[PDB]
Amino acid sequence: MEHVAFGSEDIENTLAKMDDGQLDGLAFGAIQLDGDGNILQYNAAEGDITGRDPKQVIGKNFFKDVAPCTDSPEFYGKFKEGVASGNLNTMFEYTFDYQMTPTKVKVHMKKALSGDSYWVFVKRV
Ligand SMILES: *C(=O)/C=C/c1ccc(O)cc1
């Protein structure tokens, strides 16, 4: 076995129905979004490094109301491509340095199978 897997234990499935402790003990924050970039879920992993938390970032747009860096052609860019492609599936090396310290993370976002969503999993590096 290797370290925590990015795709990990079928996140999307565990994020549509949640797991034991809402699978918040992962190493990659799992966030969802609804046709606009409105957070649907966030989990405690990423929210534990920055403190965002889901109940707090709930309603906050993860593109401009939570992270002002994801509103670019590399983060929201591949998101506007996956949303218009009908199968969001992209990743990229990003750095969360918003009002805080310099964070590094390998991102991996895909099209949630809940019916039509968009989740961005950030795996701290
Ligand atoms: C860009 O500045 C992103 C910042 C960010 C993303 C995710 C988090 O949990 C915290 C900050």
Coordinates of C-alpha atoms and ligand atoms in Angstrom, one line a residue:
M1 CA 0.0 0.0 0.0
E2 CA 1.2 3.6 -0.5
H3 CA 0.5 6.9 1.3
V4 CA -3.0 8.4 1.1
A5 CA -4.4 8.2 -2.4
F6 CA -5.6 11.4 -4.1
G7 CA -8.7 9.8 -5.7
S8 CA -8.6 8.0 -2.3
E9 CA -11.5 5.9 -1.1
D10 CA -14.0 6.9 -4.0
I11 CA -14.4 10.4 -2.5
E12 CA -17.3 11.6 -4.7
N13 CA -19.4 8.6 -3.5
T14 CA -18.4 9.2 0.1
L15 CA -19.1 12.9 -0.4
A16 CA -22.7 12.4 -1.8
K17 CA -23.7 10.2 1.2
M18 CA -20.8 11.1 3.7
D19 CA -19.0 8.3 5.5
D20 CA -18.5 7.5 9.2
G21 CA -17.1 10.8 10.4
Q22 CA -18.0 12.3 7.1
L23 CA -14.6 11.0 6.0
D24 CA -13.1 14.2 7.4
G25 CA -9.9 12.3 8.5
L26 CA -8.4 12.3 4.9
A27 CA -5.3 14.1 3.8
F28 CA -7.0 16.0 0.9
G29 CA -9.9 18.4 1.7
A30 CA -12.9 17.5 -0.4
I31 CA -15.1 20.4 -1.5
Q32 CA -18.2 20.4 -3.8
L33 CA -19.8 23.2 -5.8
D34 CA -23.2 23.9 -7.4
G35 CA -23.7 25.6 -10.8
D36 CA -22.1 28.9 -9.7
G37 CA -19.2 27.8 -7.4
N38 CA -21.3 27.6 -4.2
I39 CA -19.7 25.2 -1.7
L40 CA -21.9 22.1 -1.1
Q41 CA -19.4 20.5 1.3
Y42 CA -15.8 21.0 2.4
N43 CA -14.7 18.5 5.1
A44 CA -12.3 19.1 8.0
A45 CA -9.0 18.1 6.4
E46 CA -8.5 21.3 4.3
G47 CA -10.6 23.3 6.7
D48 CA -8.3 22.1 9.4
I49 CA -5.1 23.6 7.8
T50 CA -6.7 26.9 6.9
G51 CA -9.7 26.7 9.3
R52 CA -12.4 27.2 6.5
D53 CA -14.5 24.3 7.7
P54 CA -17.7 23.4 5.8
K55 CA -20.3 24.9 8.1
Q56 CA -18.4 28.2 7.8
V57 CA -17.6 28.1 4.0
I58 CA -21.2 26.8 3.4
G59 CA -22.8 29.4 1.1
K60 CA -19.4 31.0 0.4
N61 CA -18.3 30.7 -3.2
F62 CA -15.1 28.6 -3.3
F63 CA -13.9 30.7 -6.3
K64 CA -14.2 34.3 -5.1
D65 CA -15.8 34.2 -1.6
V66 CA -13.4 31.7 -0.1
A67 CA -10.3 31.5 -2.3
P68 CA -9.5 34.6 -4.5
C69 CA -6.9 32.5 -6.3
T70 CA -9.2 29.8 -7.7
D71 CA -10.9 32.5 -9.8
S72 CA -8.3 32.1 -12.5
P73 CA -8.0 30.3 -15.9
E74 CA -6.1 27.4 -14.2
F75 CA -8.5 26.8 -11.2
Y76 CA -11.9 28.1 -12.3
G77 CA -10.6 27.7 -15.8
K78 CA -10.5 23.9 -15.9
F79 CA -13.8 24.2 -13.9
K80 CA -15.5 26.2 -16.6
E81 CA -14.2 23.5 -19.1
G82 CA -15.3 20.5 -17.1
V83 CA -18.7 22.1 -16.5
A84 CA -19.1 22.8 -20.2
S85 CA -17.5 19.4 -21.2
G86 CA -19.9 17.2 -19.2
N87 CA -17.2 15.4 -17.3
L88 CA -15.1 17.7 -15.1
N89 CA -11.7 15.9 -14.6
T90 CA -8.5 17.9 -14.2
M91 CA -5.7 18.6 -11.7
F92 CA -2.9 21.1 -11.2
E93 CA -0.3 22.3 -8.6
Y94 CA -1.7 25.3 -6.7
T95 CA -0.6 27.2 -3.6
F96 CA -3.1 28.5 -1.1
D97 CA -1.4 31.6 0.2
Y98 CA -4.5 33.6 0.9
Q99 CA -4.7 35.6 4.3
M100 CA -2.4 33.0 5.9
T101 CA 0.9 31.1 5.3
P102 CA 2.2 29.7 2.1
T103 CA 0.3 26.4 1.5
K104 CA 1.2 23.9 -1.2
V105 CA -1.3 21.3 -2.6
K106 CA -1.7 19.0 -5.5
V107 CA -5.3 19.6 -6.6
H108 CA -7.7 17.1 -8.2
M109 CA -11.3 18.2 -9.0
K110 CA -13.9 16.1 -10.9
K111 CA -17.6 16.1 -11.7
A112 CA -19.5 14.9 -8.6
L113 CA -21.9 12.0 -9.4
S114 CA -24.5 13.5 -7.1
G115 CA -26.3 14.4 -10.4
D116 CA -24.3 17.4 -11.7
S117 CA -21.8 19.0 -9.3
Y118 CA -18.1 20.0 -9.2
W119 CA -15.7 19.0 -6.4
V120 CA -12.1 20.2 -5.9
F121 CA -10.0 17.9 -3.7
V122 CA -6.9 19.6 -2.4
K123 CA -4.2 17.2 -1.2
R124 CA -1.7 19.0 1.1
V125 CA 1.9 18.4 -0.2
Ligands
LIG1 C1 -6.3 30.6 -3.1 O1 -5.9 31.6 -2.5 C2 -6.9 29.4 -2.3 C3 -6.9 29.5 -1.0 C4 -7.5 28.4 -0.1 C5 -8.0 27.3 -0.7 C6 -8.5 26.3 0.2 C7 -8.5 26.4 1.6 O2 -8.9 25.6 2.3 C8 -7.9 27.6 2.1 C9 -7.4 28.6 1.3

